Ligand binder design. Sequence first.
Ligand code: ZN
Lengths: 33, 123, 81, 150, 129
Amino acid sequence: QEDVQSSIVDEDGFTLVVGKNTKSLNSIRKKIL
Amino acid sequence: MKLPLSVKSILPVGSAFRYTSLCQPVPFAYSDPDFFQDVILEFETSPKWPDEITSLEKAKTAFLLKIQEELSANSSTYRSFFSRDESIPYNLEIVTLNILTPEGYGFKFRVLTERDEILYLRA
Amino acid sequence: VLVQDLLHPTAASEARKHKLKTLVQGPRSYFLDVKCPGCLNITTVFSHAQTAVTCESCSTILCTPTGGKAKLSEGTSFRRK
Amino acid sequence: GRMHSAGKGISSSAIPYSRNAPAWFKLSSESVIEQIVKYARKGLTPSQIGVLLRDAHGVTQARVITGNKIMRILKSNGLAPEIPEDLYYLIKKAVSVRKHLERNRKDKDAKFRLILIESRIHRLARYYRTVAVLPPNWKYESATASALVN
Amino acid sequence: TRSSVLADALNAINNAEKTGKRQVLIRPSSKVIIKFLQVMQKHGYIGEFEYIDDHRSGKIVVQLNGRLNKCGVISPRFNVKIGDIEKWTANLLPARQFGYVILTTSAGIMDHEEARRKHVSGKILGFVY
RNA sequence: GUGAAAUUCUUGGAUUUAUUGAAGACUAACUACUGCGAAAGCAUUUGCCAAGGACGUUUUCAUUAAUCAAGAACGAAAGUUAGGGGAUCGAAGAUGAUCAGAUACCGUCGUAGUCUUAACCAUAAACUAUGCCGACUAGGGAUCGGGUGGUGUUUUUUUAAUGA
Ligand SMILES: [Zn+2]
């Protein structure tokens, strides 16, 4: 939960979008899948 | 009995419950293959279930342990133990709460969840 | 009983003001550059896009139109301007 | 002032003050014009076309990036429409609700709204024929507009 | 509707001055209003003003000292000839030594005294006293 | 049943009790110093048909605007013509009681009507008893709808909605 909703930013200026109560980056990639 | 989440539904699927056991059962005749009738459990829907399968079945184990401790507290005329059910393949954690009753009978108690179905569909 | 030199008002007051009630009417929205998961394609989109913009190569929707602002689809790495 | 109505709500869009093209924009005006012409050949209205360029392509404003209006680009490429789209839309909605009253003659409110629609239609028709973008012999009618839009 | 934009400006001016406000703001703006405030600031009945552009129709801010009794308008612009200058001054101004009625001639915008000195004649805008 | 009786109908037992069914209306409480509609007006479910407000928009075009005799649409109730049913209520009318008192002036039946279809009919204390369009000029709290920002809690978590 911390690393998912810990305000991730990329190397180049680019921040991802993350919804509320969402808990896994693997799960985000599985939604993309 | 009370638990921090509400008991939704307790149902029998016993073969003697549907009147098709090979024998009509006898009190204290626990050597029958159809002695322990299957009883399916369902609790209230919680938005905080563990979304991993082993942690989920182990939380089922914990809830059955809570049933076991409270029944050993307040229903001491009944006997109880845990039997490691494994009858479904690749699930190595099932625990049937087996209850013996001084009416001479015995049952298995096992937890079902929408979370079990949703993780099986995830699998 | 409400004193302020309107010649040089506070930028905070102008930001809190209505969009046309600014001293010079300017647009409050902006554009964005996004990076898809499917192809890492950077695309320019409107912050208030009324259309569900998708990526070019991967047909992956980037945003959803909802009223005032456009709601981005999940897992897209964005930047202002 | 929301004429033919009691409304006074104000909900519009602004303008960036500087009239020149934006700095971060790094495309071709010719590619823009091609995209426009291909979209119009695909069959969209210039308003929706400008919306598409604003959302998907990040095209801020057509007269900002290019010296031409969207309609002027379309006409220069030969894709000028027959009627202005606003009058087209009024005619189409009027026919739609005309069929709706044909289904259900009971809606006096649909009668009222159709009347006001016809009023605005006549106002814009007088205006367009004043501009003479419309043929001077042109006339809006029920049968005329139904034969036009259907 | 909003017909007379300059008269709307003048009434906002008169309203803020009757309130006793210290600076005013005017949207929209035009060159005739510009010349109006130009000759007004020249005759010192006000303080200092400033234009701001918006590319639509600009805005005007005036810091005004204390010296507006009443600014006015004649909403139909009547042609004013030479004796009509006197007639309109006698009509509008409460005493002849002071007060200024404003005229647009082909030689531009000016008060009655400058218009008499220039020997011009044209249409009437309004007055300041 | 009224202030009071009384007409009324109850052994083929009314009223009542329980079990229903039919009819036709109605859509309470929730309900607001709320909402929607040009007004009159608009509260059961769901669906469809369209429509509309407002908010948001770096979409559109570029005066296309207002006031408006003539003319056009709508217009509560009732009323009028042709149909329907027609529970209830109910101008008329018919009666019981006319008893002291109207301080306590009705009771019962019941036509039109009440609703609907197709038409008319254009009045209302149809009132904010207060021409329109436009601009300026006090604050302070509200609320509703839309949007924005951030804050928290409730909320939930590879699911179809993240709402309060
Ligand atoms: Zn792609």
